[PDB]
C-alpha cells in the first residue's frame, strides 16, 4: 500500500521546494498520477481482502473510497486555485500541504488494519480540516463553524476510543481480520448497550444523523470550496465506512438498538429535504441535501443486509461526487456574484450556457436519475428497507419526491428565469471551471457502465 | 476606527490582461501549460487509460470461475440424480449436536 502513501508524503517537499509559479501545476500533475496509480487498487478479490502487510489492507469497500480521495485532491486544487491567487507563496504552499496531509490521513484511515490506528488517523483528519475551515474561510462565522464541527466530532469519538481500548483489553486484538473471525454475540446487558452506543455514536456524528447534523451546514457554508469538497465527499463517508467496519462486533444487539437511529434517519431525510425546499442559501441547501442523502446510508448500515451494504457503498461514492460538483458550481456562482444568496443572481441559463448544462446534469444525478449510480444505491437501499418493513416505502417515496422537487427548484431558481439586471461582473466561464465540472461528471457517468466496482465487498 | 486598506476591487478578470486565459494563474505561458497539464493528465491519461484499465481488469472476483463451477455441479447433480442444491451448508455427520 506504500505505493500510494509514499508519493503522497513526497508531495509535501515537492510543493515546498517548487517555484512560486509551479506549485499548482506540479501538485495537479502528481496528484493525478497518484490517483492513476491508486486505480490499481480496484482489482479486488471475490472473497479475501488485499492484505498488503500487517498494517494496511484494502477490500472492495476501501478501494473505491481511496480512489475517490486520490481523484478528489486534484479537483480541490483546481477549485481552490481561483480565490487563493492573491495570497502569498508561503500560505499557498501551506494550504496545499494541508490538503495533502488530509489526503494522506484519509488514505491511511481507509487502509488501516487496526481499529485504533483507524481511530487515530480518522481523528487526525480533524486538524487539517479545522485549520482549512477557520483560516481560509471568508465569513466571520468560520470560527464558530470550526468549533461546532470539532466539538461534535470529538464528543462523538472519545467514547469510541474508550470502547476500542476496552475491546482491545477484553478480546486481545483490534485487527479487523481477527475481530471479524473471532467475532462473538453481544448480550442484552446495559454494559453491552453502552459499548454499542460508544462504538456507534462516533460514526453517527461523522455522517450526520438527524439531530447531530447541526455542524454540517455551518461547516459546509463557512469553509472554503476545497474544504467543503472534502467535508462532503470523504469526511462524511468516513463515518459510514467506520460503521460498516465496526458493525461486525455489534451483533446481535443492533437488531434491537438500531430502532432509534433508524427512525431518526428515516424522518430526518424527509425533514432535511423539506428544509432544502425552503432554503435561501445555496451552500446550506446543498449541505441539507447531503444530510438527507446520508440518512439513507445510515438506514442501510443499520439494517445490515447485503443489498443494504451494496446500496450504501454506491450511494456513498455517488453522493460524494454529486455533492462535490454541486459545491463547485455554487463556488463558481459565489466567485462571480460574491454572495451565496440563491435568489440574488437569476437567469444564469442565458449568460453561462455550459454551466447551465453542468447544473442540469448535477441536479439530475442528485435526484437519482436512472441509470446513475445514485439511483443504483438508492434503489438497493429502498429494496433492502422494504424487505425490512413494507411501511418504509412511504417515507422512501416521499423523500425521493422532495429530493427531485428541491433539486429542480434549485435548478430553476439559479439557472433559469430573467437575468439579474444590475449584476454586470458575470464573465464567461473559464476553462478551469468547466474542466473541473467535466472531471466531476465523467467518472460519475462512466461508473454506471461498471457499477460492480463501487458496489462494495458484498457484490 | 483603524487605518486599513480599502477593499480590493472584485477579482480582476484574467481575460483583461490576456483574453485567452483558461483561468488558473495570471502569466499566459503558465496558464497555457497548466491547462495542458490539467486536460492531458485528467482526460487523456487518468480518465481514458483509467477506464480502459478498470474495464479490462482481470477477473479476480471469480465470476466466470463460479459460473463454470456451477455448470459442472449442475451437470453432476442432474446426470446422477442428485437434488441439485442440498439443504445443509455442512455435512450433518460432522456436527456433534447437543
Amino acid at each position: 500500500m506504500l505505493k500510494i502513501i509514499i508519493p503522497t508524503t513526497m508531495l509535501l517537499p515537492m510543493t515546498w521546494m517548487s517555484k512560486h509559479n509551479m506549485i499548482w501545476i506540479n501538485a495537479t500533475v502528481h496528484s493525478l498520477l497518484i490517483s492513476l496509480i491508486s486505480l490499481s487498487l480496484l482489482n479486488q478479490l471475490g472473497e479475501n481482502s488485499l492484505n498488503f502487510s500487517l498494517t494496511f489492507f484494502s477490500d472492495s469497500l476501501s478501494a473505491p473510497l481511496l480512489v475517490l480521495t486520490t481523484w478528489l485532491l486534484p479537483l480541490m486544487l483546481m477549485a481552490s486555485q481561483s480565490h487563493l491567487s492573491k495570497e502569498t507563496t508561503t500560505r499557498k504552499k501551506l494550504y496545499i500541504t494541508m490538503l495533502i496531509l488530509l489526503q494522506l490521513f484519509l488514505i491511511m484511515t481507509f487502509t488501516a488494519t487496526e481499529l485504533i490506528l483507524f481511530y487515530i488517523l480518522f481523528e487526525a483528519t480533524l486538524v487539517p480540516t479545522l485549520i482549512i475551515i477557520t483560516r481560509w474561510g471568508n465569513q466571520t462565522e468560520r470560527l464558530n463553524a470550526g468549533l461546532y464541527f470539532l466539538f461534535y466530532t470529538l464528543a462523538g469519538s472519545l467514547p469510541l476510543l474508550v470502547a476500542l481500548v476496552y475491546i482491545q483489553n477484553t478480546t486481545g486484538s483490534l485487527n479487523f481480520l481477527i475481530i471479524h473471525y473471532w467475532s462473538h454475540p453481544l448480550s442484552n446487558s446495559w454494559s453491552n448497550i453502552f459499548m454499542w452506543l460508544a462504538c456507534i455514536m462516533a460514526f453517527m456524528v461523522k455522517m450526520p444523523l438527524y439531530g447531530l447534523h447541526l455542524w454540517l451546514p455551518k461547516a459546509h457554508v463557512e469553509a472554503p470550496i476545497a474544504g467543503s469538497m472534502v467535508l462532503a465527499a470523504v469526511l462524511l463517508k468516513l463515518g459510514g465506512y467506520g460503521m460498516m467496519r465496526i458493525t461486525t462486533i455489534l451483533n446481535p444487539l443492533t437488531n434491537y438498538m438500531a430502532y432509534p437511529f433508524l427512525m431518526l434517519s428515516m424522518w430526518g431525510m424527509i425533514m432535511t429535504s423539506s428544509i432544502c425546499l425552503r432554503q435561501t442559501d445555496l451552500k446550506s441547501l446543498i449541505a441539507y441535501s447531503s444530510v438527507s442523502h446520508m440518512a439513507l446510508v445510515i438506514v442501510a448500515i443499520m439494517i445490515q443486509t447485503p443489498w443494504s451494504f451494496m446500496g450504501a457503498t454506491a450511494l456513498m461514492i455517488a453522493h460524494g461526487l454529486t455533492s462535490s460538483m454541486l459545491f463547485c458550481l455554487a463556488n463558481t456562482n459565489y466567485e462571480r456574484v460574491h454572495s451565496r444568496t440563491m435568489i440574488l443572481a437569476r437567469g444564469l441559463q442565458t449568460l453561462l450556457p455550459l454551466m447551465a448544462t453542468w447544473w442540469l446534469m448535477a441536479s439530475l444525478t442528485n435526484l437519482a436519475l436512472p441509470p446513475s449510480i445514485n439511483l443504483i444505491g438508492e434503489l438497493f437501499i429502498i429494496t433492502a428497507s422494504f424487505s425490512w418493513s413494507n411501511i418504509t416505502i412511504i417515507l422512501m417515496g416521499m423523500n425521493m419526491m422532495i429530493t427531485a422537487l428541491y433539486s429542480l427548484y434549485m435548478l430553476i431558481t439559479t439557472q433559469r428565469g430573467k437575468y439579474t439586471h444590475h449584476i454586470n461582473n458575470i464573465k464567461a466561464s473559464f476553462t478551469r471551471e468547466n474542466a473541473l465540472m467535466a472531471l466531476h461528471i465523467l467518472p460519475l457517468l462512466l461508473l454506471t457502465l461498471n457499477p460492480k466496482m463501487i458496489l462494495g465487498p458484498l457484490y | 476606527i483603524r487605518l486599513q486598506e480599502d477593499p480590493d476591487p472584485e477579482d480582476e478578470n484574467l481575460y483583461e490582461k490576456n483574453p485567452d486565459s483558461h483561468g488558473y494563474d495570471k502569466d499566459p505561458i503558465v496558464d497555457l501549460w497548466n491547462m495542458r497539464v490539467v486536460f492531458f493528465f485528467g482526460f487523456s491519461i487518468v480518465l481514458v487509460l483509467g477506464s480502459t484499465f478498470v474495464a479490462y481488469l482481470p477477473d479476480y472476483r471469480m465470476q466466470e470461475w463460479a459460473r463454470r463451477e456451477a455448470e459442472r455441479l449442475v451437470k453432476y447433480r442432474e446426470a446422477n440424480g442428485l437434488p441439485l442444491m442440498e439443504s445443509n451448508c455442512f455435512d450433518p455427520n460432522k456436527i456433534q449436536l447437543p
Binding site: 481560509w136 471568508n138 466571520t140 460574491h338 | 476606527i1 483603524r2 477593499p7 480590493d8 477579482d11
Partner: peptide, 14 residues
Amino acid sequence: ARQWQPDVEWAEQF
C-alpha cells in the same frame, strides 16, 4: 470580498 480578518471591535472582546 476579502476574508473578515478581525477588527478592533472583535479584538477588544478578548
